[PDB]
């Protein structure tokens, strides 16, 4: 290895960062995890992820998973519905299809993750708020816990990341969408005419410029999304589950009695501005120590055209073979080209979903 005498911080717990963890660790180089989280059994809240045939499949084969995620996963068929109730389409899951995408929750991959590692290799309640580059280490500080020194420093712990100056000035932006989300338990007492309409698959729906995402089955909770563009008046508090409400019906209140039910029913909404961290200019290349970014951290985008964590599974993937060598000359050099090929699919996946969110939020879309 490059890292023989070294060892490596990966910052973020999430499934790119654990993944990086496993791809690391299997060449027997020395890794933590540093984890915000309070504990392995905190509750990841989101809809499932899927691992596409070519990117995170192959991460995952390649730390001898594949077989645990389909163990664990779903698949599902999808409904395209409009406001109204009628189903336009039902795609379902063929022999063929069945291995294709199937719909893990993420806490179920975290836990198959997680249990890949040797023991104590994740380290919990670790808020990473500070980055010192020392005299040949990096100096990590954690918010009321003892610091830690690392030869490299791997940023995988999301979009929002703080602590990115070492490597570059961009910043997150907002891109002018924004997503409601909630999740119902016991979705065929509380949802029944929803439930029923998803009929075991996923369910989208488009009326206005306002869509609708729902999984039936996360783990026995419906998940469920709306979108659309930011109100050019920001009005609506996500603490008050009343104006939440009061907002939604307003805008839906075209759609059919089973999607209001919906909102009427959800106790509480999560509400996020759609950002993006763009792969504009090129990242700094006179960096003090080994530093590099990895997943949302590195590439955050607009996930309505499916593209997130299988990106971010690549980046794995890419960066450990990079670093599990006598290939390279350097750190350094391995970073450099983990970099300059995750510039270029990272670049077309943001186009992608730049594209589809253009195309989706337009007055008249159609699947
Ligand atoms: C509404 C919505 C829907 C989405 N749907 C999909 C989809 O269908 N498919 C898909 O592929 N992707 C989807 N995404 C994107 C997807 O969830 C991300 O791409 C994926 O989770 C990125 O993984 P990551 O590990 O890079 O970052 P994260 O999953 O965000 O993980 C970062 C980890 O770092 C931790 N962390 C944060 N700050 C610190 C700190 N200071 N110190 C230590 N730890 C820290 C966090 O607790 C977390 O464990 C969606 C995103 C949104 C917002
Ligand atoms: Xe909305
Ligand atoms: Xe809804």
């Known amino acids: 290895n490059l890292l023989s005498d070294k060892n490596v911080a990966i910052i973020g717990g999430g499934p790119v960062g654990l993944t990086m963890a496993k791809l690391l660790q299997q060449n027997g180089i020395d890794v933590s995890v540093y984890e915000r989280d309070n504990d392995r059994e905190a509750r990841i809240f989101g809809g499932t992820l899927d691992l596409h045939k070519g990117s995170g499949q192959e991460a995952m ?152 995402f729902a999984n039936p089955n996360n783990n026995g909770a419906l998940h469920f999304g709306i979108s659309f563009k930011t109100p050019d008046e920001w009005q609506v508090d996500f603490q008050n589950r009343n104006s939440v409400v009061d907002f939604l019906l307003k805008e839906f209140s075209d759609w059919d009695e089973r999607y209001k039910e919906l909102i009427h029913t959800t106790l509480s909404f999560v509400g996020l501005a759609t950002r993006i961290f763009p792969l504009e200019k090129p990242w700094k290349s006179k960096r003090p120590l080994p530093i590099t970014m990895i997943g949302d951290a590195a590439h955050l985008m607009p996930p309505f055209a499916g593209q997130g964590v299988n990106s971010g599974l690549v980046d794995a993937l890419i960066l450990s073979d990079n670093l599990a060598d006598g290939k390279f000359n350097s750190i350094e050099e391995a970073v450099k080209n983990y970099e300059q090929q995750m510039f270029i699919y990272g670049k077309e996946a943001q186009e992608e979903s730049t594209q589809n969110e253009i195309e989706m939020f337009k007055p008249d879309f159609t699947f």
């Open 61 to 212: 084969k390649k730390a001898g998973l594949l077989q645990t995620y389909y163990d664990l996963a779903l698949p599902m068929g999808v409904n395209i519905a409009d406001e109204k109730g009628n189903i336009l389409s039902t795609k379902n899951v063929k022999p063929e299809n069945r291995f294709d995408n199937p719909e893990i929750n993420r806490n179920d991959l975290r836990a198959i993750l997680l249990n890949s590692l040797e023991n104590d290799t994740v380290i919990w309640d670790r808020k990473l708020v500070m980055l010192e580059p020392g005299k040949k280490k990096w100096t990590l500080t954690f918010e009321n816990k003892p610091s830690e020194t690392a030869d490299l420093v791997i940023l995988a712990n999301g979009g929002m990341s703080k602590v990115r100056k070492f490597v570059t000035d961009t910043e997150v932006e907002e891109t002018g969408t924004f997503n409601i989300q909630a999740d119902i338990h016991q979705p065929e007492i509380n949802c029944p005419g929803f439930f029923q309409l998803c009929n075991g698959n996923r369910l989208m729906a488009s009326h206005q410029g306002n869509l609708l």
